[PDB]
Each structure stands twice: as structure tokens, then as C-alpha cells.
């Protein structure tokens, strides 16, 4: 088949909000989404996973954890997760500081991806083109001491998470894996996959 551009793929297969947040992040770190395209695509994927991870997850009127698949449910419900990823450094740390002061949880040394109000812990999400058991150790060895929960997804369906605690129901994580599988397959059809995979 003909080789497509990764730029084209990213803008077509991710929602404009994801793309825009990704572009801003790269710029913030001084990179151009039109040159570092595999990095661009990786950042978009990781962002979407972060969003899908928090999607449809609230804490109910009684203070337990529920699932609502519409936007029409009750405005008294609080989102179970805070989303840290996607914010610029200043705002990201502002949110982390607010969380840390309210709940009294310890301040992480690096920006995490999410905060879980039910479990009362920060979460580091990862998405790897390599073996999850390996990527996990890389992430695990950076955070040093740990209250931060780590959850790794791959494009082939494997997961690994701290202490075998996977946080979410099977159905939610199946959604994420399906999306990753769909991303991988579509890249393959544009002959973008093999290059993307080797670039990590
Ligand atoms: O787990 C995370 C990973 C990334 C990240 C790091 C490296 C790449 C990459 N380099 N080369 N090819 N891909 C992609 C994603 C990030 C992250 C998000 C936005 C950025 F601007 C930079 C890193 N956050 C995270 O939380
Ligand atoms: Mg970041
Ligand atoms: Mn992050
Ligand atoms: Mn992450």
C-alpha cells in the first residue's frame, strides 16, 4: 500500500481536543508535532487513554463508585478521577497542590496522570509498544518511593499494574484495549505501524 503521513492519521483518528492539547504540550517542551510525528501520535494515544480511564466514572450521592454512560445523569455526582495530564506545567502543579492540601496525601515528585478520589491516590498511566513488564519497571524505578499507582497498557492487550490492583472494572479496561487495538490496526493499513513501533 501507499505510505500515509502520521500527521494525517493523528488529526483524522483523534478528536481535535486531544490533538490540540498534544500540540501545546510538545510546543511547551519545545518540539514540533510536524517533525516528531511518532512522538506526536504517542502523546495523543496516552492522552486519550487518560481520558477514557476517567470516562463514565463518578462517586455517587452515597459516596461509592458508579458508572453512568450518559451526560444527562445527575449534576450532584462528582467525577471519580481528576485528570492531571493535558495541563500545562503551572496548572498541573496547581491541581496537584490543591489535591495534596485537601486530602493530605503526600506530594509526588513528578507530575502524575490522574488522581483517584475513591482510592485516594495518584495514578501513573503508561502506554507501550514494548513488553509491559519492562516498561513498568522503567516507570517504577523513576517514581522511587511509591504511593503513586502505576497502570500499564500495551497495544496487544497486556496490562500490568501495581500490586495487581487494576482499579477499574473489566469492561472499562476492555474499552481502552479495543481502542488501542483499533489504533494499531489502522496504522498498519496506512503502513505507519512498523515505523511507529520501532521508534519508542
Ligand atoms: O507516561 C507518559 C508518557 C509520555 C510520553 C513520553 C515519551 C513519548 C515519546 N517519545 N518518543 N516517542 N514517544 C511519548 C509520550 C508523556 C508526555 C506527554 C506529553 C508530552 F509533551 C511529553 C511527554 N506523559 C506520560 O505520563
Ligand atoms: Mg506531561
Ligand atoms: Mn503524564
Ligand atoms: Mn503516563
Written account of the structure:
- Helix 1 packs parallel to helix 3 (37-54) and helix 2 (16-28) packs across helix 3.
- The chain has one domain (1-200).
- The strands form 2 sheets. The protein has a 5-stranded mixed beta sheet with strand order 4-5-6-7-8, with helices on both faces. Strands 2-1-3 form a 3-stranded antiparallel beta sheet, with no helix packed on it.
- It has helices at residues 6-13, 16-28, 37-54, 89-103, 132-142, 170-189, 193-198, and strands at 57-59, 65-67, 78-79, 81-83, 114-116, 121-128, 149-154, 159-161.
- The chain contains 7 helices and 8 strands; from the N terminus they run αααββββαββαββαα.
- The two termini are 24 Å apart.
- A hairpin with a 4-residue loop joins strand 7 (149-154) and strand 8.
- It binds ligand 21A, magnesium ion and manganese (II) ion (2 copies).
- One manganese (II) ion (MN) is lined by residues 85, 111, 113.
- It is classed as rna binding protein/inhibitor.
- The entry lists the keywords cap-snatching, RNA BINDING PROTEIN-INHIBITOR complex.
- The assembly is monomeric.
Amino acid at each position: 500500500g501507499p505510505l500515509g503521513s502520521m500527521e494525517d492519521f493523528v488529526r483524522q483518528c483523534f478528536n481535535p481536543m486531544i490533538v490540540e492539547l498534544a500540540e501545546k504540550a510538545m510546543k511547551e517542551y519545545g518540539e514540533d508535532p510536524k517533525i516528531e510525528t511518532n512522538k506526536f501520535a504517542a502523546i495523543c494515544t496516552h492522552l486519550e487513554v487518560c481520558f477514557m480511564y476517567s470516562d463514565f466514572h463518578f462517586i455517587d450521592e452515597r459516596g461509592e463508585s458508579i458508572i453512568v454512560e450518559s451526560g444527562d445523569p445527575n449534576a450532584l455526582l462528582k467525577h471519580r478521577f481528576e485528570i492531571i495530564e493535558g495541563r500545562d506545567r503551572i496548572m498541573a502543579w496547581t491541581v496537584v497542590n490543591s489535591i495534596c492540601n485537601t486530602t493530605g496525601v503526600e506530594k509526588p515528585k513528578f507530575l502524575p496522570d490522574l488522581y483517584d478520589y475513591k482510592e485516594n491516590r495518584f495514578i501513573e498511566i503508561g502506554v507501550t509498544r514494548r513488553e509491559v513488564h519492562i516498561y513498568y519497571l522503567e516507570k517504577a524505578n523513576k517514581i522511587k518511593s511509591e504511593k503513586t499507582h502505576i497502570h500499564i497498557f500495551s497495544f496487544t492487550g497486556e496490562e500490568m499494574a501495581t500490586k495487581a490492583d487494576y482499579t477499574l472494572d473489566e469492561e472499562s479496561r476492555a474499552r481502552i484495549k479495543t481502542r488501542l487495538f483499533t489504533i494499531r490496526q489502522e496504522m498498519a493499513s496506512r503502513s505507519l505501524w512498523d515505523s511507529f513501533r520501532q521508534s519508542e
